[PDB]
Design a protein around this ligand. Sequence first.
Ligand code: ATP
Length: 538
Amino acid sequence: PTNFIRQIIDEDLASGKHTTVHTRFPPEPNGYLHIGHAKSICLNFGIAQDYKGQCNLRFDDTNPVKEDIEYVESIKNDVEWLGFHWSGNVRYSSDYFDQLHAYAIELINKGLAYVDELTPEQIREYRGTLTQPGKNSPYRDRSVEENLALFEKMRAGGFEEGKACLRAKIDMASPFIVMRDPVLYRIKFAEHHQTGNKWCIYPMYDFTHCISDALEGITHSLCTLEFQDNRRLYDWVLDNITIPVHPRQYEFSRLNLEYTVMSKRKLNLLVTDKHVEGWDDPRMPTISGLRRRGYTAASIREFCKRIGVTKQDNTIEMASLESCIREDLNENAPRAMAVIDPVKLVIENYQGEGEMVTMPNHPNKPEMGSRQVPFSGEIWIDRADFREEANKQYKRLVLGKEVRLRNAYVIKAERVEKDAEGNITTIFCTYDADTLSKGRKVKGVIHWVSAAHALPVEIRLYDRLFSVPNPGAADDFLSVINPESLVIKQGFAEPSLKDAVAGKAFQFEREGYFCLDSRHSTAEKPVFNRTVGLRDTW
RNA sequence: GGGGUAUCGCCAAGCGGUAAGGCACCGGUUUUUGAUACCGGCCGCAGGUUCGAAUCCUGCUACCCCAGCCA
Ligand SMILES: Nc1ncnc2c1ncn2[C@@H]1O[C@H](COP(=O)(O)OP(=O)(O)OP(=O)(O)O)[C@@H](O)[C@H]1O
């Protein structure tokens, strides 16, 4: 695993610039973590463990209004669930409010900061545009003493929101818009989830992030491409205050996934408007959502490893992600029998109430042991596996042909029965009671579940949440939601599944990987989520 | 205006000496899962320097980001 960032780290180590690597994952606690965050997590924690260094978990809680304790809680859960551990205690940018406040005072004393009274609208008007330079505020020249007195007033709550703010004194004609006197502090009479109501002024991201990294001893600050401009302000702040270290920022491209949105705002909308059961709905690209869906922490790490880390914009295909969960589950998920679209089949040549047949826990792995399953003259099978008239390509059950029942006998169709609508209600067939080994020639195998002690199971089949590749680029991404993202079915599963535990995925043979969903499961009717289907192609 | 980016459908090695790999797709073998496994198939443009260019240069073109008291 190598990328431009690890090459930068190797160089620093060799040149002697650094003797140890210290990174951090700094999520703002304003929503749940998604697969995009996981990319950043593998990168940052990944780098630390490979270089025997440290990686911090720092909640960048600089905007109380959009934040909640709920999110800091779930975020820690998901980072841990992914298998990563942070260095020392969980950190919070808010742990540094007193420090940041002191640094703002240092800038003011050096005349590199001033309190501006331009309204929130006028500041945008004075900023200029992408092509036109901005102009200096009429307050820009206040004296140190006055800026000092005015900033203390901001802090003491003497100014209503937006009636004043602290700005850095840089260059209003800079081609970098972020350098046109960026706001350093803004007033918000809002309760903070960590500091309560001690503060009514809060530091902005650009002021907060570089100082927090610095204070924490960060060596390589890793973020996404949209902050490349910000790096100039990141360096300006550290170059102009009294601080011993100067971490360097390196930006890589964000992960984008086809058929889904990765914007926290848009995921929040889906949850707020109830278009998904919640942040962890199985169709969400959130970590908790992939977890419920049946994804393993190891398959997510594998994915992050495969997509690489560069500076090129990208949108990875779902197939790539699904490939990672299949490979994992294919190797470790024990097999089981279930029928999603059940049709009653009756073996007339079968006498008795039933018997017990042996079924391996993994056809390619005997070390996973075997189990006992009931077989009777009345077993459920899937509609799709039976057809009166079928070509040569079809290998399943045909009106007058015979197939091999999984881990059982070789039956043979003989007749059917249609109801009023004309839909088959029951398939009659006979079987060879001497089948359990390879004369003749059979071609085709199908799964089944005896109606004897069948377990009435609800199966949830999920699909892409959105019907277009780049829903985020649509005028209204909500209007492009896939109405079939979730299709609920009522099937039957072998009785052993009665002991399935949420968080353990089985491979329902010839149908895909599934796992119990504790949210909808009950003692009566269990609910299984289909993680992903098997590769299907004749 | 400034910051970035361009290598086979989607990702991505490469850092001037015959262009890795993964995903996808498509063939073939094995298979009592149409699965798995194992084979096989598959340098943005124009010039320039150079014995030699994906790599260095110049000039294009396309795309992404920046005009929050968000991050
Ligand atoms: N899609 C992504 N792919 C890789 N890293 C991401 C992605 N989205 C956010 N990150 C990074 O994860 C860390 C925490 O991000 P943060 O908590 O601020 O979410 P965010 O900025 O709101 O991103 P989003 O807009 O996707 O919600 C930052 O380094 C951020 O750049």
